[PDB]
Design a protein around this ligand. Structure first.
Ligand SMILES: CN[C@@H]1[C@@H](O)[C@@H](O[C@@H]2[C@@H](O)[C@H](O[C@H]3OC(CN)=CC[C@H]3N)[C@@H](N)C[C@H]2N)OC[C@]1(C)O
Ligand SMILES: [Mg+2]
Length: 268
């Protein structure tokens, strides 16, 4: 029988979500199973669990981000440049591969959305505006990004049936790790500035593998390796949300662990 909002809220409380919390979810809706009113039921449950003083931050990205189409070029290729839609945060759908729940999060009334078209983050709650801006090209997941502020805001990572590769906040550890050989990428995004499309080309850390040995197309990347080690080494609340095995992780702790993990393995 499909899970009700009330059942999910009680499960989230059992896992350790408290009123006032700052939560970043990563969700496998297949693992959760049928919901009374579809994915919105779980969105509503998350909002209720964090309460009117809590916040939700999600890495939603953009369905039509021209990442692969501009990757490695010093400017967008001509055909891309002429016709690609500018990123419009009010209308641009979420990237389906990071979870079908994210389109429901980003369309929730009052949700705020960050300006980085490829790394776009959505936030709900009183601190949403502070979470989502600034989010500049060249600062996808590291210092000055919404992830940085999430880590300073007592953030908890709520993994609902998601794998250890799903932990976006660990890209902050990659960004700041004092290690040799870090990979960078160059890509271009079409932004709206005063109503006009402006192409911006930037470089940033490679979020598909910070070192060559972590950059196989189907990983494991460093995020996955760090998170697997961390979860083998740390007490973390575990329990069901819907039908999904779930975990509630202290974000600052896992990121600090990840910085140490990288720096212990790779020369400066
Ligand atoms: C929307 N644009 C996207 C662009 O943002 C980027 O997405 C990254 C994403 O793959 C990473 O997740 C993958 O990682 C690996 C192994 N590397 C295997 C499967 C996934 N777990 C994530 N950790 C960081 C994301 N930034 O590349 C793809 C893209 C579609 O172009
Ligand atoms: Mg507050």
């Amino acid at each position: 029988t499909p899970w009700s909002k009330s059942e999910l809220v009680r499960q989230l409380r059992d896992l350790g979500v408290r009123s006032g919390d700052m939560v970043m979810p990563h969700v496998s809706l297949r693992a959760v199973g049928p919901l009374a009113d579809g994915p919105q039921t779980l969105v509503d449950a998350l909002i209720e669990a964090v309460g009117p003083t809590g916040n939700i931050l999600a890495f939603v990205s953009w369905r039509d981000s021209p990442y692969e189409q501009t990757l490695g070029h010093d400017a967008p290729p001509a055909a891309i440049a002429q016709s690609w839609p500018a990123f419009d945060p009010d209308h641009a759908p979420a990237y389906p591969g990071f979870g079908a729940i994210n389109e429901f999060i980003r369309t929730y009334p009052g949700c705020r959305r960050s300006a980085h078209p490829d790394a776009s983050m959505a936030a709900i709650g009183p601190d949403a505006a502070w979470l989502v801006a600034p989010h500049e090209m060249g600062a996808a997941y590291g210092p000055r990004s919404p992830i940085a502020r999430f880590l300073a805001h007592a953030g908890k990572i709520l993994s609902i049936g998601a794998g250890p590769d799903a932990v976006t906040a660990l890209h902050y550890a990659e960004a700041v790790a004092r290690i040799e050989g870090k990979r960078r990428v160059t890509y271009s995004m079409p932004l709206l500035r005063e109503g006009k499309r402006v192409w911006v080309t930037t470089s940033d850390w490679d979020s598909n593998g910070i070192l060559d040995e972590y950059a196989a197309p189907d990983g494991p990347d460093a995020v996955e390796r760090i998170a697997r080690d961390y979860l083998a080494r740390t007490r973390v609340a575990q329990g069901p949300v819907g039908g999904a095995q779930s975990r509630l992780i202290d974000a600052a702790d896992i990121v600090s662990f990840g910085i140490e993990w990288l720096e212990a393995r790779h020369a400066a």
